[PDB]
Amino acid sequence: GQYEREAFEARRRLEESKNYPGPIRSATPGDTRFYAGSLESILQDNDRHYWRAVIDDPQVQYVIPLRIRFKLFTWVTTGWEQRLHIVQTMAPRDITIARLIELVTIENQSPYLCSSTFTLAVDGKELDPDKSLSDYGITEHSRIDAIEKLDHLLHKDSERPLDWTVDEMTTECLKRSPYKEMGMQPQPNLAPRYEARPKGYFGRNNYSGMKQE
């Protein structure tokens, strides 16, 4: 890209020059934690909440915000759905993917997703747990996927979630992982209320990148 490529070019030239004094840290401003707007927003790594019109020094990014696209079984109240669940982890540049996945395990707040040991991938081909992030070329942009130990089975219908829209929830399902809490029979408050997507939302067939109808 006309930015990633070029900022890498210059980030590299900067150390292709030894006649360079260092940065004047009092004059290399950080970012402000207090600003105008309303939220505690996070901008980029190179960006300041204020105006800093300078072209500050292109510095190496020590910890990468790595984004791992899990698979969370959601419950619109009309079936279970497959939807994108990125967990953007701030991870260093020197780490082995083994420790990276240990890291994501500690990082998630939905343990719907770290029940069983999983692995990483980029455009398919797995990454080994003995080499590190630059050992393949992981930036914050590496369009990574994540693959569970039961990903090759979700076309199947054995471990597929037994939903009360189309399936029989026995009593033993009423003491197992999602269903003890999912809230089958509506309380006076419908206690844990979930989403709801129509049975006729997308049309007669489901969601695809290409035009079917």
Partner 1 sequence: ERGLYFPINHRIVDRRIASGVTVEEADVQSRYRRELRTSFATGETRQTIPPAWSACERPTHFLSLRLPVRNVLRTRVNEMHNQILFSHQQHAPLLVPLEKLHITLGVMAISEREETERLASIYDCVSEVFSVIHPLQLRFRGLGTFGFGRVLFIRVVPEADFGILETAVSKIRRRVGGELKVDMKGNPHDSYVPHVTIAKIRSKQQTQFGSKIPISMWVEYQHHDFGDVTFSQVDICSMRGSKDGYYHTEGSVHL
Partner 2 sequence: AKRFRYNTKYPSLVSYNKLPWEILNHETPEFHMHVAPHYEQIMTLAASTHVPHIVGKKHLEMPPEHRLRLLPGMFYMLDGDSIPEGFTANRVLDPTALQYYGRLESLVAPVQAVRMLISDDLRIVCNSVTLQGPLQLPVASYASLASLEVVTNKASASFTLFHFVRPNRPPSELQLEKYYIHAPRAMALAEFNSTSNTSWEPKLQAPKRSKRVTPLPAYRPPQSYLMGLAERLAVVPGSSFGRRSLMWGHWF
Partner 3 sequence: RRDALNGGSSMTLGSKGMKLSPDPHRRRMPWTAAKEYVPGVVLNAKEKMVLDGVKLVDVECVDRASQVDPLEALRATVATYEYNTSTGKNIFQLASQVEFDGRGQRFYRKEWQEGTYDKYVTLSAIDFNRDGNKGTAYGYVTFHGETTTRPVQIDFADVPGWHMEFRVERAVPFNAIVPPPPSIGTDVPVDPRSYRLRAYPFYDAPNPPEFVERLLKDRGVIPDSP
Among partner 3, partner 1, RNA, none, what binds residue 203 when CB lies within 5 to 8 Å by partner kind? partner 3
Q: Is 47 left (phi over 0), alpha (psi -120 to 50) or beta?
A: beta
Q: Which structure tokens are listed for 18? A: 């030894």
Is 4 in contact with 21 (CB distance < 8 Å)? no
Q: Which structure tokens are listed for 191? A: 């206690």
Among partner 2, partner 1, partner 3, none, what binds residue 15 when CB lies within 5 to 8 Å by partner kind? partner 1
Q: Which residues pair with 82 in a beta bridge?
A: 73
Q: How far is the CB of 49 from partner 2 (least distance, A)?
A: 16
Among 7, 14, 184, 190, binds partner 1 (CB under 8 A): 14
Our finding on whether 210 is near RNA (CB under 7 A) is: no
**132-141 residues labelled b (16+ CB within 10 A) or e (exposed):** bbeeeebeee
The residue range among 1-9, 108-116, 180-188, 191-199 that interacts with partner 1, by the rule CB under 8 A, is 108-116
Binding positions for partner 1, rule: CB under 8 A: 14-15, 17-18, 20-26, 33, 39-45, 47, 62, 65, 67, 69, 72, 83-90, 94, 107-110, 140
